[PDB]
C-alpha cells in the first residue's frame, strides 16, 4: 500500500519488455514450431513412398 | 524421531545407434540395390533413433 | 469491533491511497 505506484510501474514495464523481446525475432515457440515440422515430415513420407 | 528416507529414480538410458545398411545388407553391392527398391525406410529408423 | 487486538500500525496518513478517518477501541 506504501509502494503502489512503484509497484504499477514495474508491472507496466514489464509487460511492454514482453512485447518487444516477441518482436525481436526470438525462437521462445521453437515448442509449437516443432509439432507443426513433425506432422508435416511424417505426412510427407507418406506421400513419398 | 528424525528419519531419513532414500527413493532412487531413473533419468535416462542409454543412446544407441545403428547403421541400417550394416546389419541389412553388410557390404554386399546387389544387397543395396536391392534395399533401394523399398524407398526411404533406412533414413527414417535413423531419425527416430535420433 | 475494530480495536488494537486484530489491527497493526505502520506508518502515517499521507501516503496510502483511500485511507479514511474512524477510530480504534482500546481496552485500557
Ligand atoms: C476510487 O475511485 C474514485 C473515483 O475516481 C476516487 O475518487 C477514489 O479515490 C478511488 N479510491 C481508491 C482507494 O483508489
Ligand atoms: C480525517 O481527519 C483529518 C483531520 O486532521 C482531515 O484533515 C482529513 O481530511 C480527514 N479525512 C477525510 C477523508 O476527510
Known amino acids: ?14 509487460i511492454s519488455q514482453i512485447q518487444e523481446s516477441l518482436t525481436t525475432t526470438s525462437t521462445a515457440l521453437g515448442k509449437l514450431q516443432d509439432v507443426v515440422n513433425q506432422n508435416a515430415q511424417a505426412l510427407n513420407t507418406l506421400v513419398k513412398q | 524421531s528424525i528419519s531419513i528416507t532414500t527413493e ?11 547403421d541400417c545398411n550394416m546389419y ?18 533406412c533414413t527414417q529408423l535413423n531419425r527416430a533413433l535420433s | ?7 497493526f500500525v505502520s506508518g502515517n496518513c499521507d501516503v496510502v491511497i ?5 477510530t480504534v477501541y482500546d481496552p485500557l
Not at chain 1, 1 to 14: D, G, L, R, T
Not at chain 2, 8 to 18: D, E, G, L, R
Not at chain 2, 27 to 32: L, M, V
Not at chain 3, 18 to 22: E, F, S, T, V
Request: aromatic share 8%; with cysteine.
Open chain 2, 8 to 18: 532412487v529414480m531413473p533419468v535416462s538410458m542409454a543412446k544407441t545407434s545403428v
Open chain 3, 18 to 22: 483511500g485511507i479514511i478517518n474512524n
Open chain 2, 24 to 41: 541389412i545388407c553388410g557390404d554386399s553391392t546387389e544387397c543395396a540395390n536391392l534395399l533401394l527398391q523399398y524407398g526411404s525406410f
Open chain 3, 1 to 7: 469491533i475494530i480495536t488494537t487486538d486484530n489491527t
Open chain 1, 1 to 14: 500500500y506504501e509502494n503502489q505506484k512503484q509497484i504499477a510501474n514495474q508491472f507496466n514495464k514489464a
